[PDB]
Subunit: 311 residues, 5 copies
Amino acid sequence: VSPPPPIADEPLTVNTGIYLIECYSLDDKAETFKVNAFLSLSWKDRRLAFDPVRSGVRVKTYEPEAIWIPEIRFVNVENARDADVVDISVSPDGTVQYLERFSARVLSPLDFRRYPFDSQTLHIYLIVRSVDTRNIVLAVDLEKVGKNDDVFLTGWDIESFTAVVKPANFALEDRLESKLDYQLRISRQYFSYIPNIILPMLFILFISWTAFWSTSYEANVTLVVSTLIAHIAANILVETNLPKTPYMTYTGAIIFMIYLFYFVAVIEVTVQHYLKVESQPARAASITRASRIAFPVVFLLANIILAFLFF
Amino acid sequence: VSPPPPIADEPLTVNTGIYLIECYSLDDKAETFKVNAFLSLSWKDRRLAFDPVRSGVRVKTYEPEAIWIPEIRFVNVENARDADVVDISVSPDGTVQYLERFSARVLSPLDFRRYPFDSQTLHIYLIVRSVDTRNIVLAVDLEKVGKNDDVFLTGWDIESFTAVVKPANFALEDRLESKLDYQLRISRQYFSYIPNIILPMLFILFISWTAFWSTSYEANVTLVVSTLIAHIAANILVETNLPKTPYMTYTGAIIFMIYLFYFVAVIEVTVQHYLKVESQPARAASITRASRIAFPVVFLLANIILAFLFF
Amino acid sequence: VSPPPPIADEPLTVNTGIYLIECYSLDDKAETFKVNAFLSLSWKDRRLAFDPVRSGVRVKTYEPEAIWIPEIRFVNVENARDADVVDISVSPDGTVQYLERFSARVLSPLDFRRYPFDSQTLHIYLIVRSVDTRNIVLAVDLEKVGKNDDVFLTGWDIESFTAVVKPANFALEDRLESKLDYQLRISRQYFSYIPNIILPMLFILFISWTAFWSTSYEANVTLVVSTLIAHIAANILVETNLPKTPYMTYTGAIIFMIYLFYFVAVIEVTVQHYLKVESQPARAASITRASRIAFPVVFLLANIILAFLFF
Amino acid sequence: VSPPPPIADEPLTVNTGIYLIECYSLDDKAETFKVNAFLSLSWKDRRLAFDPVRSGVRVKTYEPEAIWIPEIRFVNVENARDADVVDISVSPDGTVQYLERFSARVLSPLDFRRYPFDSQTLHIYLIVRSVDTRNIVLAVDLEKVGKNDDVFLTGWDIESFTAVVKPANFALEDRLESKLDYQLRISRQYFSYIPNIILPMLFILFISWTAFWSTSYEANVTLVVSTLIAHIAANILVETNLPKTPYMTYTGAIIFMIYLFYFVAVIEVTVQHYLKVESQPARAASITRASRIAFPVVFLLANIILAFLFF
Amino acid sequence: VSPPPPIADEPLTVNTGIYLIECYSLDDKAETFKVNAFLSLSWKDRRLAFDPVRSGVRVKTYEPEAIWIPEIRFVNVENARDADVVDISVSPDGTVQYLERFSARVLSPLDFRRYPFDSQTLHIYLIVRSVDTRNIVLAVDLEKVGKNDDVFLTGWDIESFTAVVKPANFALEDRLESKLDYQLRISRQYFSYIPNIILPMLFILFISWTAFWSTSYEANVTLVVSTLIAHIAANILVETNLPKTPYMTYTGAIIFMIYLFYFVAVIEVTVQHYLKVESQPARAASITRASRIAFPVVFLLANIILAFLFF
Ligand SMILES: CC(C)c1cccc(C(C)C)c1O
Ligand SMILES: CC(C)c1cccc(C(C)C)c1O
Ligand SMILES: [Cl-]
Ligand SMILES: [Cl-]
Ligand SMILES: [Cl-]
Ligand SMILES: [Cl-]
Ligand SMILES: [Cl-]
Ligand code: NA
Ligand code: NA
Ligand code: NA
Ligand code: NA
Ligand code: NA
Ligand code: NA
């Protein structure tokens, strides 16, 4: 129970492969996702080699404790994976074919810049630490890298699950470390966001703009202020389903922009009333009539500007 | 231990059976449900066979570690099942009768299209991976497939728990995989939804329609706007108890439709007031009188259209 | 390590007893409760018998692995109990006295029909599966069935903890199953509900009825509508602390009834205003004066009707 | 591996000691707190005695499985403690000095009568069950009872951690049980409650009292009703951070009292308006002028009465 | 399996090192953070010495149970760390090089005085208890102390991860304890707080100040009261994401100060109206005109005073 000895002075290549069985619980706020998959490992151990003609069997099955197995770990995991060894098969040349079924909560940062029209690249980093006898290098066996067709992630479209074939070999605490990158590309299902958040938020804003077709300050105050309270409720609802980003998000920009539109509408409503009391409604009517065109035009213009800056 | 050797070149049939003891925690947002059940397994191992006459005993009881047991796993589970082996009995012909009691959180997608008048088909997928010595095929023993009469799922009616007798045999990572489908059919108890969400949401909408029997713009603004705020509160309450679907739900359609009715009511209230100020209330009175009939008629019409499209 | 052999052809009686140490976490929505208790088990194993005179000792102490112990399980538990064996004592006749301390989350449905003036019967079902050698039957040893005096359940009064002495013996998967019923009777502490939810909800309803002593439609709309928003807030607060029941609850009935009172008050307020505008306030004043008596009388009458139907 | 034999007919005294390392997660609603501490145990086992001269060593170190250790449990815990044995030392006379580091979620009821100006006495109950060979009695070794200086409980001031030196010896299931009481005295940090809940709640109430300096019923309705909605929001916020008590709390009393003040203010506002419409404002002005003095005086008076009844 | 014997009378130096792999879940309310890191331990055990010539290997690999490993614990952890031993290597002199990968929830108090423009010093305390044979002293091996470049903490900037090289050696329960301090310095990413909470909270306050450009008491009441309700919503949203501190926070001060500004605005609105009714609007106009300048000036002044007191 030690690493296999090298024939010359070559590092031990451990061929890896992750096959996704179940994908679930993508927490946007925590930037984590739960995964249930197969982990396949393959290496050459010449000490386990046998003659197939004399043995009578073409493959030998071993228990994990009986043979040497590379200590393969995941970098971006909360806790160590819950694994159950499925099978260990040894071919006559000494090539081990290890398979285990694992479940782990993976930590992968998300880019909310384009939310809810955003795409993500979820990562799963495989790692091996080189032993004192010899160095261990990871490899990708594309034949054993894939996903089940049933694999569904609620509110997401699963594009592809590939692996960066070239490992990131580096020094860590005076020992070699071979790191592999498994990438799960996903795109957000933005459909629900339109009738649930986008359109209701636009309607309450358009309702506040009816104050531009009214001279009643008491009714105008009620219109602009109440709809602002509805927008504050909408802002709270959205910001709780998202983490605190050091960058501006597309939704964050719009929500903040809408706050300015309510503030400027309050100013207009205040100015309109002040001029009516000061016995000059001709100045107020012209401002109110201008606002009827200005508010939707500037809103459409600014939205085009924002959409261009983000997409 | 190792798999039992085949007499000819036949695959090993492992007869299965799931008997539900407890069903609980159906998370709609997570599309998961917790289950506590019996898992019965039966296979022929000729190496364990004995003569009942000289043994003196008709059945031999073994501990799990003593004999070979097929590695039976669940496909759609978050983590590996928590199992406690109940009994292992061996008949004289070598037929093993294994029984275990398990508990597992099962991942099964739900169809919210008809919510809260929806029915679901919960799945439990049993799976076995074929070994190098011989292939393992799963079978359904209908005698050991059932459920306890006490089995209750909060807010759901349990119809039936059956199994698709024919297994889905397929190739996975260069090995045969035998997959069985256990189906738990349930229907939602929609009763509570009527006095808690449906009727209160209709009442607040009918209260907004009283603005069609009033000329006071200040009172009308207060009526339509405040009731809209109540509907926004109701929308938030409903959408949090449901996951983000790429398709339209029945409740989602109604909620969204009601938003249009509030918006058009605001427009009516705005138009009515604008005409009263412009000294033409005959035009306003006729629009307001038409709305008294139009709003309930178009609402009833659209609801019939929606109910037909969904049911 | 097999069951004790029968002297004749009698089943093995395993005397049980549950002594509650701690009762906590009664989740109304989940219909679950956490329990920490002692589980006492007693059976006759003649193979363990000894002469007290020759042995010099009255009782022999064994480790769980050394002797045969019946596989006692709980039916209505989420996961298998966390148990620590306290003591195993054997008397000279071969009678084993087993004791363990366990902790388990128990699933017991609750009847919310009379909430918050409801009483519950929490269940703990003990079960044993008969082995092939002989049948195992459960029994109640009332001496070892009880509870600690400190045992407290937050917001509940603990009446009694008894056991149904006669077991439910039945056939399951071609084997005998002996099931015992341990009942924990509790009654809800309804005190808090009066100053926190009942009285504040009645006050906001009485505030809406002040519109019957006002002719100002603008003020009346504000009165009835705002108080309705407060009642919607109260409805949301209550319904979240309760699960979705297929039956009507006492609180559910009142909340729904109060919604009708707000709707009819809106109708009255609308009718009153319509008649004032139509230049016939004598008709409006008489309706408004009638409502001053009708609303509290019909409310008190309907509450008496509801209380009678539920209690 | 059995209890040490008595020299005469004396019970075995097991000297205990708890040294708090970390105190955290005091859940007020659940009435639980998490603790990380050292558990020291000391007893005399003459079978383990040795001559220091012949042995060459003054102290013998044993592994838990090698020697007999008393089964010490905690009464008021959710689940059995997570313990790691630190050290087991045996002096030449046979005195064992056991030490372990544990972590456990402790259930201790809290008295919310004086909340948020309340003090609590958290309990940790140590217990031992007497074996058949001899009786086990617990003792307090004050030298090994203490706490770390860094020990902090968020929003609480830690006064003292002492132990009731005299154990509660009692009979349970025909066996002796020795119970010890470890008391952790804490007092609530009420500072935050003043600018966050107390003062904002008083301000909204004083804002409602401005209706006593106004004749506008429409403005008065808006004043008293809106501020009541703010108080309902405050009531919901407070009651969620507290469990449902069968007794009245200090905060509960104030919140409920404030509801009466809003109701009486609505009555005043209603009466004032009714008299203005009935063409008798001299009666209304006198009532309104009286209320300007009555409301703050009766509020201050009732608060003094309440503070006296609770403190 | 006992500590290594000293050559003279020197304490055993155990060289430590923590290398952060993943940093996540910084709960502000709980004052906890989750960490996934490498724990390296190195000590001299002369009993494990070997001749590389005779053994055939330059470095001997052992399993944890085979050799003596110092009982290294963390002080400020909720529960004992979840560790997986990576490697144990022994050089021919007997120097052990232990490595494990751990995951633990660390308890570290935070200073919210400057929130959300605050910086924190997270602590990780390593500790060893001296055995009876010899004393164990901890040391820092700066070569094995570091962090991964990918290490990200959501909403935080990771400055440095260093260790206090000099251990805190002290007496505890009559035994020596060597304590090391690993410090993770972080600074809050305050960006999000500006468009999400700061600016929307300032806008609603400026909207309330429009009442200084209006004589309509009914509109003014609606303005100041509704915006106060929005500020109460904002206060609740902020205070839930923060724990109850016995000290004043920067955000806590501003929120509380804003409450005074709303109260004084209500007083102004009340005074203005009272004077208009008392037929003296010249006194009211002058107060209202003064408030137009006073409110923004005093607000800016007080904010400068607060920012100076906190920064
Ligand atoms: C406290 C709560 C559960 C409750 C009980 C009884 C009556 C009501 C209202 C509807 C008056 C109520 O909300
Ligand atoms: C974002 C939040 C924590 C906060 C920080 C700083 C200042 C304010 C006020 C001025 C809005 C504030 O609420
Ligand atoms: Cl891992
Ligand atoms: Cl499984
Ligand atoms: Cl169980
Ligand atoms: Cl314990
Ligand atoms: Cl630890
Ligand atoms: Na191995
Ligand atoms: Na086996
Ligand atoms: Na046993
Ligand atoms: Na022992
Ligand atoms: Na060791
Ligand atoms: Na109003």
